[PDB]
Amino acid sequence: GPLGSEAHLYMQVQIVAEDQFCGHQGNDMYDEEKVKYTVFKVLKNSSLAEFVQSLSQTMGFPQDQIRLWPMQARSNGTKRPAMLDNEADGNKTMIELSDNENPWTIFLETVDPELAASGATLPKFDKDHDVMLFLKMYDPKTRSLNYCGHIYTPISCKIRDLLPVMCDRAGFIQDTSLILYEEVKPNLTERIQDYDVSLDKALDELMDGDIIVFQKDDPENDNSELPTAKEYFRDLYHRVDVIFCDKTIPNDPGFVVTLSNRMNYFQVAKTVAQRLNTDPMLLQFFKSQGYRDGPGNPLRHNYEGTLRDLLQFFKPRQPKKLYYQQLKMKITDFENRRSFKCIWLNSQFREEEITLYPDKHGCVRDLLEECKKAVELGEKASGKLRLLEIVSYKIIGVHQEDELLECLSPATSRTFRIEEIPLDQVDIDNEMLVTVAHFHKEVFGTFGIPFLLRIQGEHFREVMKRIQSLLDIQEEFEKFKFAIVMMGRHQYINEDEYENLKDFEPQPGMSHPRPWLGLDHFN
After folding, report:
1. List of residues 6+ apart from 138 with CB closer than 8 A
2. What are the beta bridge partners of residue 75?
3. Beta strand 340-345 with 415-420: parallel, antiparallel or unpaired?
4. Beta bridge partners of 492
5. Beta bridge partners of 390
6. What span, in angstroms and rounded, lies between the C-alpha atoms of 187 and 77?
7. Torsion-angle region of residue 417: left (phi > 0), alpha (psi -120 to 50) or beta?
8. Which positions ≥6 away from 280 have C-beta within 8 Å?
9. Bridge-partner residues for 353, per DSSP?
10. Calpha distance 487→320 (Å, rounded)
11. 388 touches 400 (CB < 8 A)
């Protein structure tokens, strides 16, 4: 194996009986992915007469009461039965007749099995003057199609004379006034405007396997969501069933919404929001892909495409799915959130990487409150926040809350830090806030965590043990060395005699950068 040497000699012929046409709700006779066939494996080079007897035997029919109407495609994409003459074209072989279709599907017509016991012959059909039409009846109250079989008619027959047949097969009195459409193709259902015309003239390109759709003309109809068959099919044509899965709870079965191709975002949203009981603005949707099954870029409200546009990357036989999430705030605010990566300095003096989402048009205060929402602030402490800007492990700034977040540096050397203010740094007057920074170095080899301090002049040895309880370094804090650092210069200060002032400030002669206390030691 697997494939056998003589396999190429063979083609496949899918026979489809008229019962498959019943209850079909779409265009043409049946849906291709539901229809039940009788499949034959026939020899490519074999003949029609051969296949017909073989068929006859298998199906349980005499040959003089079946006729085969090959299902043939048309330019407009529809598929309908077509005439094939079982006698003229019988000498010919199956691939020839098939036009190399593999598989080939054929409509097997049969005698009404009631008149079949009687031994009834299938009616004579003139290839040139008769047509085989198919009838469908459209019922407004139930939005459904009900198959009405087929008829042989001369093409000279005035349409008016088909009315009684149509009524009798639907289930109507003869007085019943009908509306007749031709189903031409999907999204084209054409009302026959005038019944006192021959079929030949009534319908353009009249041929076998053409479809007349008829309905009752009763004022009752106007109550239906879809009064005419024309509306039924136009609705059908744009109908699409979409699966909405939540992008936050994976292995979500999701659910199926029936929507329309034509709908816009507000309409799609309004519809999904309903059977979620939540607001459409409390929903965010995601642009979609197709086959690498997964939520793409957040589709955004200002969006103005149609649902057809959102599913344009889908294969037709592939089931349709869109991802969404549920929102805690208005949709229109969620999009104006800014991703803001910074450092949270807890009250254990240790650094945590946190990403906060304040509003784009927000200010520093706004960022601070977003931070307080994510952190415990150490009991009985101050519980007040400030934002620092840090570079090379040195604090270069403290930003006012009223300052717009927009004004802050995108730069990646800049590191923003949020911390709560120690209790002894909120009231101030004979006392100052100074920047402190660790180091090895001459003056630029800075490292570790900088911080703000508590500089009037007094005991320096006490300042040191305060920094000691804060750095919480057990004693390797001996062999530290401490320095004031200003513009182009740094004077040291031993741990013995020093008592300071406001040496820290620009000696009169530019306002920034300010000096800093620096802590000299290893790693």
Report:
1. 144, 145, 146, 181, 213, 214, 215, 228, 229, 232
2. none
3. parallel
4. 483
5. 395, 415
6. 12
7. beta
8. 266, 269, 270, 272, 273, 331
9. 343
10. 67
11. no
HSE-CB for 23 with a 13 A CA cutoff: 4
Q: For residues 485 and 452, what is the distance between their CA atoms, to the nearest angstrom?
A: 15
- How many Å apart are CA 394 and CA 383, to the nearest integer? 24
Q: Give the whole-angstrom CA distance, residue 360 versus residue 366.
A: 10
Contact by Cβ (8 Å): 18, 69: no
CA distance 142 to 220: 12
| Helix, coil or strand: residue 400 | coil
Is omega for the bond preceding 513 within 30 degrees of 0, making it cis? yes
Kindly list the distances between the CA atom of residue 315 and the CA atoms of 4, 32, 76, 283, 320, in Å, as whole numbers in the listed order.
Answer: 33, 16, 20, 26, 9
The phi and psi torsions of 89 (rounded to 5 degrees) equal -90, 5
Instruction: Report yes or no: 517 and 482 within 8 Å, Cβ to Cβ.
Output: yes
SS3 of 330, please? coil
CA distance 224 to 448: 75
Which two tokens mark 360? 């784009």
Question: What amino acid occupies position 401?
Answer: E
* CA within 13 Å, CB half, 327: 20
Instruction: Select from 47, 20, 207 the least CA-distant residue to 132.
Output: 207
The coordinates were experimentally obtained by: X-ray
Chain breaks in the chain following residues, C–N > 2.5 Å: 429, 455, 475, 499, 509
Listed in sequence order, the residues at least 6 apart from 335 whose beta carbon sits closer than 8 Å to its beta carbon are 298, 300, 301
| Residue type for position 98 | S
Residue 56 and residue 15: Cα distance in Å, rounded? 12
Helix, strand, or coil (residue 306): strand
Q: What are phi and psi of 242, to 5 degrees?
A: -110, 140
| φ, ψ of residue 339 in degrees (nearest 5) | -70, 120
Backbone angles phi, psi at 116, to 5 degrees: -75, -35
Q: How far is CA 51 from the centre of its chain?
A: 48
Resolution of this entry in Å? 2.8
Alpha-carbon span 282 to 168, nearest angstrom = 54
Written as one letter, the residue type at 462 is: E
Beta strand pairing call for 178-185 and 79-81: unpaired
Which of 51, 43, 46, 48 lies closest to 9 in space, CA to CA?
43
The C-alpha atoms of residue 100 and residue 78 are separated, in whole angstroms, by 19
Q: In angstroms, how far apart are the furthest CA atoms of the chain?
A: 130
**Contact assessment for residue 259 and residue 240, using Cβ atoms and an 8 Å cutoff:** yes
Closest listed residue to residue 124, CA positions, set 153, 158, 95 = 153
β-strand 66-73 against 144-154: which pairing, if any?
Answer: unpaired
3-state secondary structure of 450: strand
Phi and psi of 289, rounded to 5°? -105, -70
Those residues with Cβ within 8 angstroms of residue 395's Cβ, 6 or more apart along the chain or in another chain: 388, 389, 435, 437, 450, 451, 452, 516
